[PDB]
């Protein structure tokens, strides 16, 4: 699916519709020092094999695409994520498809 | 190579005609539904001898063909090759099924065998029209066609003029007074409800 790089939508802090910068959010590093990671590293330390299960029954062939709305208006800089239905193709701000054009 | 007619004599299931869903059906054995001197007017075959069923059963296409040939075979010999006009008034549309073996009934749905004709009580099976001197030639020939059909059938000579829906004792005067116009196998009923220019087309 195609979404533009710019979208004028609502902003929480200002309270008015303002233009926003559109980009795709990607998963960050686990940071190795979370409560669950520290709990899991202590539990897996020592003998006993492995304590928590490993999910190995994947069935989804896609992911829910997520945007990252950046507020372009200065001194606000409010970030937000908007959820869009599942798809396996995703690009930004290109090929507006030119309705009424050559098919070949 | 097929099962006997005892298996499919009764109307057991809902009507299952050959359609978009019911595809892959082998062609019915009966193709020609009327023969004889079919290119004939209604003024020369005013008998209308009928075959009437008496039970609520199923008539297979090969059973209709069996009674088509034997009734026609003697009827040609009796009065002549073109002294009659016969019809069958059952067109086999219901499709019967087979659960073919080589598992049991693990996912057992039928496959088409052929067509079959649903009949009600008192519905005409076979219609024969000819002249008045061949009345006994039609009745006993229809008795020969009873043996090709399962169940009980009765022989009735109708009071209709030919293959029309009008009574034979009063068919003449509407022709003379011009309320009926023959068109080959049938007749045209002329009501007094059309344009008057159609009335001016006749009566002149």
């Amino acid at each position: 699916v195609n979404v533009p790089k710019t979208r004028r939508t609502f902003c929480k802090k200002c309270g008015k519709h303002q233009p926003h910068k559109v980009t795709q959010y990607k998963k960050g590093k686990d940071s190795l020092y979370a409560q669950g990671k520290r709990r899991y590293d202590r539990k897996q330390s020592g003998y006993g094999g492995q304590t928590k299960p490993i999910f190995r029954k994947k069935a989804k062939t896609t992911k829910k695409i997520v945007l990252r709305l950046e507020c372009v208006e200065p001194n606000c800089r409010s970030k937000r994520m908007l959820a869009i239905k599942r798809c396996k193709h995703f690009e930004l701000g290109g090929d507006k498809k030119r309705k009424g054009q050559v098919i070949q | 190579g097929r099962r006997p007619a005892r298996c499919y004599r009764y109307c057991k299931n809902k009507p299952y005609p050959k359609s978009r869903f019911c595809r892959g059906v082998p062609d019915a054995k009966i193709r020609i539904f009327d023969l004889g001197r079919k290119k004939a007017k209604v003024d020369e075959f005013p008998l209308c001898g009928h075959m009437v069923s008496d039970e609520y059963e199923q008539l297979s296409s090969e059973a209709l063909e069996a009674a088509r040939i034997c009734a026609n075979k003697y009827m040609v010999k009796s009065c002549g090759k073109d002294g009659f006009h016969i019809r069958v008034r059952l067109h086999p549309f219901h499709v019967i099924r087979i659960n073919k073996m080589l598992t049991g009934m693990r996912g057992a749905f039928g496959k088409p065998q052929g067509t079959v004709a649903r009949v009600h009580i008192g519905q005409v099976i076979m219609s024969i029209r000819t002249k008045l001197q061949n009345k006994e030639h039609v009745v006993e020939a229809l008795r020969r066609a009873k043996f090709k059909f399962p169940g009980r059938q009765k022989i009735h000579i109708s009071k209709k003029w030919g293959f029309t829906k009008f009574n034979a004792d009063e068919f003449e005067d509407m022709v003379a007074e011009k309320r009926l116009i023959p068109d080959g196998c049938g007749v045209k009923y002329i009501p007094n409800r059309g344009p008057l220019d159609k009335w001016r087309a006749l009566h002149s």
Binding site: - | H50, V52, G122, Q123, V124, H156
Partner: protein
């Protein structure tokens, strides 16, 4: 097992009648519905938003809430152990005035007219409705002629 869809088996339920398709008449939209009005449900296939479920089709309810362009009513639905007085939101095209109540209201007005009347007279006029009584024995006449004899028909095979 059948599916659990919202519009299962609504091939003939949510379908417009013969030669009644096209633009919806405007008299159904601009009808007025107060609180407590007796309202029956008939789903219309042209409009789709605010469409009631097929289990309420043909049922009647009572108005408890009136919004801008929809009316909330309380219907009586029975589900396998009891009748639920449940609350549904439905658009106007599925809303018609039920005339089952209208026969009772016109009777109350006529009874109260006959209650104020004959109050100065005191006569006990029959006020309640009564079922069909016996047919009040009467004389029947024939004008000279005798009742003509009827006869069962002889059997002839029509087919």
């Amino acid at each position: 097992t059948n599916t659990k869809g919202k519009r299962r088996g609504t091939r003939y339920m949510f379908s417009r009648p013969f030669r009644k398709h096209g633009v919806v008449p405007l008299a159904t939209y601009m009808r007025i519905y107060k609180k407590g009005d007796i309202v029956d449900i008939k789903g219309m296939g042209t409009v789709q938003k605010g469409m009631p479920h097929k289990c309420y089709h043909g049922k009647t309810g009572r108005v408890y809430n009136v919004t801008q362009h929809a009316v909330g009513i309380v219907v009586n639905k029975q589900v396998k152990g009891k009748i639920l007085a449940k609350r549904i939101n439905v658009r106007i095209e599925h809303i018609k005035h039920s005339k089952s109540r209208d026969s009772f209201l016109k009777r109350v007005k006529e009874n109260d007219q006959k209650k104020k009347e004959a109050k100065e007279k005191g006569t006990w006029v029959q006020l309640k409705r009564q079922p069909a009584p016996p047919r009040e024995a009467h004389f029947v006449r024939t004008n000279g002629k005798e009742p003509e004899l009827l006869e069962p028909i002889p059997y002839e095979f029509m087919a």
